[PDB]
Amino acid sequence: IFFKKDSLWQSEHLEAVVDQDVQRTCILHGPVAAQFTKVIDEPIKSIMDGIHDGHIKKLLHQYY
Amino acid sequence: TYKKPTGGIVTVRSEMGEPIHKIATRGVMLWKEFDETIFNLPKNKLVPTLEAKRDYIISRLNAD
């Protein structure tokens, strides 16, 4: 329990971990989805509209 | 990911035994090591293992 309990928040507050060391923390991340995570601080809008603009542009090309 | 870190992510056991994909950081590698060595052990044989490895466990916890 002492080891495992409440091991989520720390990734989002290094100032409350020892040495502000990321490498101590747990960061939850999909093995498959880690292939597409490349651009740091890309505005949520940019990413979510980027995907939607992809899907429209291809769909329009293929069925209209 | 179940056996070894695969593309930098690894599977570790939760508190209830549910798997979780996290980044293979030193903290999560220790977490996996203690899932394979300590936490898996039957309740009776837990306590003798904790004194047996006390100095090892502490040096890891304070490091990683």
UniProtKB/Swiss-Prot annotation, chain A:
It comes from the Eukaryota. Fatty acid synthetase catalyzes the formation of long-chain fatty acids from acetyl-CoA, malonyl-CoA and NADPH. The beta subunit contains domains for: [acyl-carrier-protein] acetyltransferase and malonyltransferase, S-acyl fatty acid synthase thioesterase, enoyl-[acyl-carrier-protein] reductase, and 3-hydroxypalmitoyl-[acyl-carrier-protein] dehydratase. Belongs to the fungal fatty acid synthetase subunit beta family. Present with 91800 molecules/cell in log phase SD medium. [Alpha(6)beta(6)] hexamers of two multifunctional subunits (alpha and beta). This is Fatty acid synthase subunit beta. The lineage of its organism: Eukaryota, Fungi, Dikarya, Ascomycota, Saccharomycotina. The chain holds residues 1027 to 1090 of 2051 of the full protein.
